Amino acid sequence: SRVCQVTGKRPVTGNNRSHALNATKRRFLPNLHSHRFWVESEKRFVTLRVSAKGMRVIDKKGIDTVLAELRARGEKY
């Protein structure tokens, strides 16, 4: 599924609206990517299906923390 393994971001439904405001169902879905991440603390690469932001989080908090989560939460990975 199109779920960001870091943020839990998933597709959400909203509307389209024309210039005449005609509503047509639609979905916003996240900017997923799947990415080889180096951990070093395990001498290995791990591919997380990750959103940008998901990346920007990993940048900030730093991988291992994020990996504490997921494992804390049960995410396969």
Binding site: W38, E40, M55, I58, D59, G62
Partner: protein, 50 residues
């Protein structure tokens, strides 16, 4: 993404400076290649003691 260096490296190499690198440059090459590391405000003290 400021990070601190480790070896020489590019038009910024210095064995331990606070640069401001582009993130992709950072978290895809330098760190996985061990040529820098994030400056997590804890890291800005170990290479700010020398």
């Amino acid at each position: 993404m400021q990070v601190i260096l480790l070896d020489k490296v590019a038009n910024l190499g210095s064995l331990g400076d606070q640069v401001n690198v582009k993130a992709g440059y950072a978290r895809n090459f330098l760190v996985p290649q061990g040529k820098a590391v994030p400056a997590t405000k804890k890291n800005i003290e170990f290479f700010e003691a020398r």
